[PDB]
Design a protein around this ligand. Structure first.
Ligand SMILES: CC(=O)N[C@H]1[C@H](O[C@@H]2[C@@H](O)[C@H](O)O[C@H](CO)[C@@H]2O)O[C@H](CO)[C@@H](OC2O[C@H](CO[C@]3(C(=O)O)C[C@H](O)[C@@H](NC(C)=O)[C@H]([C@H](O)[C@H](O)CO)O3)[C@H](O)[C@H](O)[C@H]2O)[C@@H]1O
Ligand SMILES: CC(=O)N[C@@H]1[C@@H](O)[C@H](O)[C@@H](CO)O[C@H]1O
Ligand SMILES: CC(=O)N[C@@H]1[C@@H](O)[C@H](O)[C@@H](CO)O[C@H]1O
Ligand SMILES: CC(=O)N[C@@H]1[C@@H](O)[C@H](O)[C@@H](CO)O[C@H]1O
Ligand SMILES: CC(=O)N[C@@H]1[C@@H](O)[C@H](O)[C@@H](CO)O[C@H]1O
Ligand SMILES: CC(=O)N[C@@H]1[C@@H](O)[C@H](O)[C@@H](CO)O[C@H]1O
Ligand SMILES: CC(=O)N[C@@H]1[C@@H](O)[C@H](O)[C@@H](CO)O[C@H]1O
Ligand SMILES: CC(=O)N[C@@H]1[C@@H](O)[C@H](O)[C@@H](CO)O[C@H]1O
Ligand SMILES: CC(=O)N[C@@H]1[C@@H](O)[C@H](O)[C@@H](CO)O[C@H]1O
Ligand SMILES: CC(=O)N[C@@H]1[C@@H](O)[C@H](O)[C@@H](CO)O[C@H]1O
Ligand SMILES: CC(=O)N[C@@H]1[C@@H](O)[C@H](O)[C@@H](CO)O[C@H]1O
Ligand SMILES: CC(=O)N[C@@H]1[C@@H](O)[C@H](O)[C@@H](CO)O[C@H]1O
Lengths: 160, 324, 324, 160, 324, 160
């Protein structure tokens, strides 16, 4: 995507990871495993939730009202009414259709950004203690256990 | 050992359209478009619609002899008419400002039908029976409107009538009446005697005079005469005064009213139910909180914006790439 | 040994406006705004517009003596009027519900002019000649409308007339007629004898009566009298019945109709051509598939949204930096 | 731009490269040359095309209809009609004008993104076999021929 | 030795809403929503509104005896009415096409009130005094409209009147008059003698006839009779001709006009001032150049789009994280 | 944000720096100090200014006009009028509300972008003469004076 992470340098997703949207794999001497990054996943959810509520909540709900009834000598007003109704129809359709399209592009790019920022937040934490392989993987030089793994995904790690 | 950064994937098959790409599978999404209806004509704002059965607003107001059952109302949020709603103006003629009245009555609170000018009582000096017609026929026999009285002459003598009503209801009173225009000057006499008659209705804000438009015309429902119907809303405290020398289709029943804010009429064959809804369409109620619907442009209530879209699915999750 | 990453540039000078920056040169772009018209009044939906020349809708319908050429139509998608279109109601008076009629006739399918009440035949007992006027003058001489007949009295005697027509056309029939209101009671006699006349027109859905409004008024086209024109649409199978004792400007010609969905009239001096178009403006046709046009708000057809912009150029390529 | 690549660290464009929007130069012992990156250029074109079709196709084309005609005693309705027409006018102008502006910003950023992602896709392929010079150029340590050049722009290269 | 990259922060507490996050503090912002009004009814386009005080458009036009002060106008951009503006049609009756007239007069350039048919002069052969009523009472005494003359019979004799006026003003002339409909045939005689009267008004584009609608009605302002008022715009060069045999409430004063483009009426109690504005609301003027306002949907002038928002604050600076 | 710089790897802002939006700290042997990056700060202001003018200037200002007046037998037209006015109201509110929201997200992301691009512009100038610490700080290996500092924030520096 716009940030080239999702379907990018990290080619695929994990059906394995199910506690959140972004997270870490990790393969230790005491086993492999998936863990979601709770911080970013929540931030994302709060954002997407807010995004949806804006699009839904901001609509000034109509307040009763139909269309009208005209006799055979009221064709001109009848058609004015129709022009009004069709007018609103064309505007709402176009704006609805385009809004969703933009919002969507933005949303997917949002997620792409969150993945990339997570990758770079790990990269700049490990520095020269890990090797950048690819597909979002760091291989450690110092062989680190489940306690250290949790420091990394927890943001504490430490050892430039 | 080794740590990797990565993103969620799953068994989802939801697809959303983006601006650069159509049909993208995403892990999660929400729908913004309401495209399902209820199948039923529901209550609007707690209250139910007025149903008229085989009658339309005119027939029900005038008291067409076929609307003897729906003499049942008390307060409604909107009116429903059906495909099988043709019983209305049975004696051919024009109902004045009919669409407006239909508009005004579309919602109502306290609604009483009452006997404004009692039949056997109000009209001495005039012939209250024999005011019937094959056009408005009941159970085969000739009859008339239940709410209107066809006053004819009494032994070759139609004395100028001056009947008046005062509105002590503390609400508006809808008063209807008609004026009969015979087909030829010959009937004008056998009916109302006075060759040169007039009907005059007067209140505070209403002063119109009507006059017999005698002429030759095609027969509608085997009738060459015509009958124009007129209404008016009498304000609490006001007086309406009928003064006529013939051609008067006088009030017999009137209505008491508290008009509603502003609803409308919906024409549908869908069944009314005891259910509730904030948005009503002709095909059914729309349980709606979403911003858009594609079910029907005509509507009544707090309704999503009608749209011509088929799909307004908004991505919430990310691009779903299970690469299984 | 090296390799470089980079982007396309070219000789393009297209500019687009972005939100942060005005006037940016880009390698490629498309236009979203239609700002060019055709110069010609084109066919709408395969069919051509009705042209009226020097006559307006009224004159052409009534048969103003100047509209003897455009007695040529068969079906049209919309009507065109020009700056030089003033021949209409030549005898002064009001054309009732004129804008409405103009609206209704704006598109039509099968359109026949026919002779409803033949001149030398339908009106015995009345004077069919001498019903002419200097107001509606032809080739210098006094004449009248070609589609209407000015019935006057016959040897001081105007016997109540009762002429009726049945619609066996299987389509609507547009019937026009007029009622003459003389300037003074003196002319009312030399013209229609019966001092107290009336004209009455009746069908299934039409019952109006008219009465001579004798009065003193300024002369329009050197005429102190006035003539009100009336129309009505007779439904297939229906009967219209004219009954009058004077003042009747009877039908002579009527029209058969299939009314169109819903078009309009456009007023322009542009030349009609044999070309086709989905969007028609007053200045010319708009070959349009783009979403917006800035040529004219009033329009007929499937037209881009009218907009007040000058430029709606949308970037497709990238920022063009040829670096010369 | 938003991704700082176009008119950024890669200062200018190539009139030389004409088979696509993004691509590689390359100077070998067997000659200089331009080549477009087919993969990304197509992806981009499909995107921009879809973008343009959305903006044009989504418009619910009016369906016949004019303005109306009123007499001298229908001024109030005449003006209501005018209010309707002018109303639609202001809405369509504003939305049209701003839509194009946003779409344009997005589009140029899109291209900026695609250039950057191409640069980083090459960078993370060559790793310590090339030197990051600037202006989007890598200088090889191992002096590589037209066969290797094609492996790089082809995505195969290989030799961390 | 170090250099650092970083961004501005400050003491700002401005907050804007973004799509992913509500209430974000930013270093700088602008407001896009006008939510403040002026408190005063201002000048629109250099010119001031017409004020009517305790009278409404009808009373001021007809010359209700209470509107003797606001006989002061020359040109106005729009009209203002207040809560205390009920002096209008004092003799009960209907003002024809009233809303339309109000609409037409909403803005005007050159406006002269003049004496079209002088009272002591134009009406010989008729009784010009005694045309007063307790309904339109002045300083306790019975009086009448200042601009209209109640012509009554002169010694049991009302000779057909034929007064005409030519428009040499080189602008439109607004002419009003009324027709009196007595309560009973008894008053029709003591007032206008001729039992069967008529009033007739005729110009180039105006030919209507009126006739006494005698009937029994409730008393409004202690009056059983009614008086319908009629107006018309006479074009420069035209002639209007009044011809009547009774029931005519003749013109005495008329108006000369250049009608304005298209304004409106605003009903407010706010004080008029000498200030200027491009956008006027009922509560006060709106100094407005911003795209949106949330002060009032009804408006006159070049006005921001009315909106139901509370806050439309647009970020210009960056996220303000002072890290104090 | 979308570029993970502001409130990101650069955790906070500087009340100290007051000549612009983005800029440099710097701690030398001859003193500490703040300096704004004039080039980018101006570019940004021109952009944000243009952004605001678009949103305000593009509005096709109404041109006089009220609502209308109808009698008791004109309820249907009265309500048509109301439907028109309420219609425009719902459209304007929704589009106003969402426009500001989008624009704002965009604007903050714009600033986030400008900060990141500035950081990376410095990073790829210093190369292996400085050490990437974090919080947007480079620590020099060659200990450089106020003259060199100005070469860095001036874009000249030079010494791969
Ligand atoms: C007033 C009347 O009853 N007219 C009918 C007329 O009757 C005549 C008398 O008027 C006359 O002097 O003497 C002869 C006998 O020598 C008759 O009694 O007769 C004609 C011809 O048959 C009749 O015409 C037609 O009648 C149809 C309608 O008749 C009714 C109806 O069913 O609606 C009868 C009903 O009784 C009557 N209503 C009242 C209240 O008296 C109405 C009423 O007359 C009309 O509604 C008025 O417009 O008529 C129908 O019109 C049919 O097509 C036609 O042949 C006269 O109606
Ligand atoms: C969430 C939390 O409390 N963080 C701690 C972290 O500080 C610590 O480094 C690690 C043990 O290695 O365990 C984590 O759970
Ligand atoms: C009193 C009356 O009008 N009866 C008619 C009946 O003659 C008609 O054929 C039927 C068609 O539905 O509807 C009724 O209204
Ligand atoms: C009682 C009655 O009038 N029956 C009518 C019948 O004459 C007609 O065939 C049909 C046309 O609408 O409607 C029926 O109900
Ligand atoms: C009219 C105006 O504002 N000036 C524009 C300028 O913005 C633009 O850069 C240039 C094309 O290079 O064309 C000028 O006309
Ligand atoms: C008959 C008709 O309606 N046509 C008129 C004509 O009579 C008149 O003399 C002329 C003005 O000079 O304008 C024409 O259009
Ligand atoms: C698409 C294409 O050009 N195919 C080439 C292939 O023939 C070659 O073996 C390899 C590098 O040697 O790069 C591949 O992509
Ligand atoms: C709380 C705070 O620091 N605000 C001050 C403000 O009061 C003062 O007016 C200005 C000096 O001109 O500087 C601001 O930073
Ligand atoms: C400055 C200001 O407008 N106050 C806001 C308040 O309205 C809001 O509820 C809250 C959101 O967390 O943040 C405060 O700073
Ligand atoms: C003479 C006139 O029409 N003016 C009316 C008056 O009759 C009425 O008593 C009062 C209260 O409604 O308002 C006055 O201004
Ligand atoms: C006695 C009379 O004239 N009736 C009303 C009176 O009830 C009202 O208080 C007054 C106010 O000015 O206006 C009068 O028209
Ligand atoms: C809307 C607002 O409050 N702005 C004010 C305005 O009220 C005032 O009339 C004007 C001075 O003439 O200055 C503006 O800035």
């Amino acid at each position: 995507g716009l940030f080239g992470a999702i379907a990018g340098f990290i080619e695929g997703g994990w059906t394995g990871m199910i506690d959140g949207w972004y997270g870490y794999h990790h393969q230790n001497e005491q086993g492999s495993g998936y863990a979601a990054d709770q911080k970013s996943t929540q931030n994302a959810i709060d954002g997407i939730t807010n995004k949806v509520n804006s699009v839904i909540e901001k609509m000034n709900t109509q307040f009763t009202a139909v269309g009208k009834e005209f006799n055979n000598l009221e064709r001109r007003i009848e058609n004015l009414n129709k022009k009004v109704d069709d007018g609103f129809l064309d505007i709402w359709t176009y704006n609805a259709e385009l809004l969703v399209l933009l919002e969507n592009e933005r949303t997917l790019d949002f997620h792409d950004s969150n993945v990339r920022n997570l990758y770079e937040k790990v990269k700049s934490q490990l520095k020269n203690n890990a090797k950048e392989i690819g597909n979002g993987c760091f291989e450690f030089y110092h062989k680190c256990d489940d306690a250290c793994m949790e420091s990394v995904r927890n943001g504490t790690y430490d050892y430039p | 050992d080794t740590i990797c950064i990565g993103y969620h994937a799953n068994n989802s098959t939801d697809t959303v359209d983006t601006v650069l790409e159509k049909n993208v599978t995403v892990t999660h999404s929400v729908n913004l478009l309401e495209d399902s209806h209820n199948g039923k004509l529901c209550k609007l704002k707690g209250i139910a619609p007025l149903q008229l059965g085989k009658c339309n607003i005119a027939g029900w107001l005038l008291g067409n002899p076929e609307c003897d059952l729906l003499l049942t109302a008390s307060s409604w949020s909107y009116i429903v008419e059906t495909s099988n709603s043709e019983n209305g103006t049975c004696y051919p003629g024009d109902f004045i400002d009919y669409e407006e009245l239909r508009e005004q009555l579309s919602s109502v609170s306290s609604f009483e039908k009452f006997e404004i000018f009692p039949k056997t009582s109000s009209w001495p000096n005039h012939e209250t029976t024999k005011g019937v017609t094959a056009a408005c026929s009941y159970a085969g026999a000739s009859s008339f409107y239940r709410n209107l009285l066809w006053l004819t002459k009494k032994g070759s003598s139609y004395p100028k009538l001056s009947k008046s009503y005062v509105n002590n209801k503390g609400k508006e009173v809808l008063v209807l009446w008609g004026v009969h225009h015979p087909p030829t000057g010959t009937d004008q006499q056998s009916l109302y005697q006075n060759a040169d008659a007039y009907v005059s209705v007067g209140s505070s804000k209403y002063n119109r005079r009507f006059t017999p438009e005698i002429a030759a015309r095609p027969k509608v429902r085997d009738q060459a005469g015509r009958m124009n119907y007129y209404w008016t809303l009498l304000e609490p405290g006001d007086t309406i005064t009928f003064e006529a020398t013939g051609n008067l289709i006088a009030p017999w029943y009137a209505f008491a009213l508290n008009r509603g804010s502003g609803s409308g009429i919906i024409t549908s064959d869908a069944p009314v139910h005891d259910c509730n809804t904030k948005c009503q369409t002709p095909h059914g109620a729309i349980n709606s909180s979403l911003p858009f619907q594609n079910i029907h442009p005509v509507t009544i209530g707090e309704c999503p914006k009608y749209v011509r879209s088929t799909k307004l699915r908004m991505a919430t999750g990310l691009r779903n790439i299970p690469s299984r």
